């Protein structure tokens, strides 16, 4: 939690341009908590209250919608505000090229609709999310894939037989819900282990073309920067072209 907040405040302070940005994407993170918190803080500041009052915040589902309202920020919809200025969100893993695995919380669809509608997309995470090189290195649970519910047998068959997935499960709802997770868009989630992914761009397209697949947890050529919090208060940043700094 320590690390999570560190990354978030730097991400907002360095990238949110009070002169340029009005439509802000707020993601489904447990790290974004501190993004919404930071933005909320600017609204409590007499210096920025007037400009921050006018920010319209676009959610990526229910926790996100909640984080916005609870921070007293204006809540908009992506349908009314389709051109987003800047979006902040978490990630389940980030690779050396700022390709992401997302969807650990089953909200990958609206996360991607928002992030790919944004001029700038910023990821905020704790340092464990930063892979030595490839997606699928430390996030071992699979690429989340949102699917039409009637297709779960077909999609599982295709992922195994055509795409050579190593492991494919329809995500179940645990103690909160018996049987399959249903998303905010009324879909199922498959978690598909592909091992370490060397060509995530190619992998995404292959999964996306499948009959039954709604969207993948692979976010490709989208994030412009990722901020990673350390417990020790420090923050590392990954940018495009393999450039990284503290």
Residue 150 found at the interface with a second copy (CB under 8 A): yes
Q: Which of these ranges, 4-12, 48-56, 129-137, 209-217, lies near a second copy under the rule CB under 8 A?
A: 209-217
How far apart CA 108 and CA 217 sit, in angstroms, is 6
Question: What is the nearest approach in angstroms of a second copy to the Cβ of residue 94?
Answer: 19
Q: Identify the residue among 19, 50, 79, 161 touching a second copy (CB under 8 A).
A: 79
CA distances from 108 to 39, 94, 146, 222 (A): 23, 15, 8, 14
CA distance 20 to 43: 17
**Is 79 in the active site?**
no
Choice from 163, 182, 196, 230 touching a second copy (CB under 8 A): 182
Query: What does the block give as tokens for 225?
Result: 């920067």
**Which of 43, 51, 56, 113: binder of a second copy (CB under 8 A)?**
113
Question: Which residue is catalytic, options 37, 79, 111, 239?
Answer: 111
Does the protein bind a second copy through residue 215 (CB under 8 A)? yes
Q: State how far the Cα of 82 lies from the Cα of 24, in Å rounded to an integer.
A: 11
Which among 49-57, 94-102, 165-173, 229-237 is the span making contact with a second copy, rule CB under 8 A? Answer: 165-173
Q: Which of residues 61 and 136 has its CB atom nearest to a second copy in the complex? A: 61
Site membership for a second copy, residue 186 (CB under 8 A): yes
Residue carrying the six token digits 């907002």: 12
Closer to a second copy at the Cβ: 27 or 235? Answer: 27
Closest CB to a second copy among 88 and 152? 152
CA 88, 90, 94, 99 torsion: positive or negative?
negative
* Of residues 25-64, those binding a second copy (CB under 8 A): 28, 30, 61-63
SS3 state at 171 = coil
Give me the residue label for tokens 């210096």.
Answer: 47
Tell me how far CA of residue 16 lies from CA of 55, 120, 131, 195, 226, in angstroms.
11, 10, 26, 35, 14
Annotated catalytic sites, by residue?
111
């Amino acid at each position: 939690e320590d690390a999570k907040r560190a990354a978030a405040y730097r991400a907002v302070d360095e990238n949110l341009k009070f002169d340029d940005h009005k439509i802000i994407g707020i993601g489904s993170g447990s790290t974004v908590v501190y993004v919404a918190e930071r933005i909320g803080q600017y609204l409590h500041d007499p210096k920025f209250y007037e400009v921050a009052s006018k920010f319209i915040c676009i959610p990526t589902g229910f926790q996100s919608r909640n984080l916005i309202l609870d921070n007293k920020l204006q809540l908009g919809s992506i349908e009314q505000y389709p051109r987003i200025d800047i979006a902040f969100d978490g990630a389940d893993e980030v690779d050396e090229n700022l390709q992401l695995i997302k969807g650990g919380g089953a909200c990958l669809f609206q996360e991607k609709l928002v992030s790919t509608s944004a001029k700038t997309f910023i990821v905020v995470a704790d340092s464990r999310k930063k892979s030595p090189k490839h997606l699928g290195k430390n996030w071992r649970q699979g690429v989340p894939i949102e699917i039409v519910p009637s297709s779960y047998v077909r999609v599982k068959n295709d992922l195994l037989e055509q795409l050579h997935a190593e492991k494919v499960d329809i995500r179940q709802g645990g103690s909160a819900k018996a049987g399959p997770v249903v998303t905010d868009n009324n879909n199922f989630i498959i978690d598909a282990d592909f091992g370490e992914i060397s060509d995530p761009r190619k992998l995404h397209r292959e999964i996306k073309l499948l009959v039954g697949v709604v969207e993948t947890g692979l976010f490709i050529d989208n994030a412009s920067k990722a901020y990673f919090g350390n417990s020790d208060g420090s923050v590392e940043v990954t940018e495009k072209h393999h450039h990284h700094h503290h």
